[PDB]
Amino acid sequence: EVNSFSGYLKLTDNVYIKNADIVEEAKKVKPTVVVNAANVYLKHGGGVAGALNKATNNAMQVESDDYIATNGPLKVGGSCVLSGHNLAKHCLHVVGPNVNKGEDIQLLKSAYENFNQHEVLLAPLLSAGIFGADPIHSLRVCVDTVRTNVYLAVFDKNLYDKLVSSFLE
Numbered sequence: 001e002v003n004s005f006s007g008y009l010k011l012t013d014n015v016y017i018k019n020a021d022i023v024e025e026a027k028k029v030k031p032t033v034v035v036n037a038a039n040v041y042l043k044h045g046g047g048v049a050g051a052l053n054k055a056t057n058n059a060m061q062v063e064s065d066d067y068i069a070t071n072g073p074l075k076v077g078g079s080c081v082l083s084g085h086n087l088a089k090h091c092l093h094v095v096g097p098n099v100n101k102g103e104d105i106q107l108l109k110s111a112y113e114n115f116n117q118h119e120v121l122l123a124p125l126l127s128a129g130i131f132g133a134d135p136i137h138s139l140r141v142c143v144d145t146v147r148t149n150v151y152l153a154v155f156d157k158n159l160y161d162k163l164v165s166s167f168l169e
């Protein structure tokens with residue numbers, strides 16, 4: 001079965017959310033597109049990007065290095081489409097702003113806009129965690145910006161509960 005998302009809570013007609021690890025979701029669901037929370041040089045050194053690369057046994061990093069050699073780095077708020085490997089048909093590498101490194105939070109709208117070129121996506125909460133954005137603000141930007149169908153996997157039950165409570169106010 002295609003895009004077999006299970007156990008999500010529907011927030012709006014096009015945004016769903018689950019307390020789950022995106023890597024485990026990508027193995028179970030086999031989505032058409034999995035979003036990576038990338039950096040501009042596609043160096044998958046930790047967090048979500050490191051976990052998705054490790055699940056591909058480093059095939060994602062080798063492919064990413066070859067892409068950067070030919071095309072140069074991405075811009076903050078930009079994206080590229082590369083192979084999904086064993087995790088998805090395609091990986092959409094999206095660069096949200098890293099507020100902890102001084103990048104502009106306004107670029108988070110441009111980052112989510114990349115999602116609208118794909119009908120269905122499995123994605124993480126952009127710019128949250130160590131990128132420093134307020135995760136409740138990142139969910140609000142996602143809901144207001146994404147028009148295609150997006151399944152958000154957030155690997156922390158405490159944050160999940162705060163995000164669902166905030167949306168339902």
Ligand SMILES: CC(C)[C@H](Nc1ncnc2[nH]c(-c3ccn(C)c(=O)c3)cc12)c1ccc2c(c1)S(=O)(=O)CCC2
Pocket residue numbers: 020021022023037046047048049051124125126127128129130131135153154155156159
């Ligand atoms: C907010 C947080 C709960 C969320 N975390 C995650 N959300 C969804 N699936 C996840 N898998 C893992 C994971 C991490 C270690 N290892 C070993 C794994 O195997 C699997 C993390 C994780 C998240 C959302 C966005 C971003 C980050 C973190 S960040 O800090 O990586 C910087 C980039 C933006």
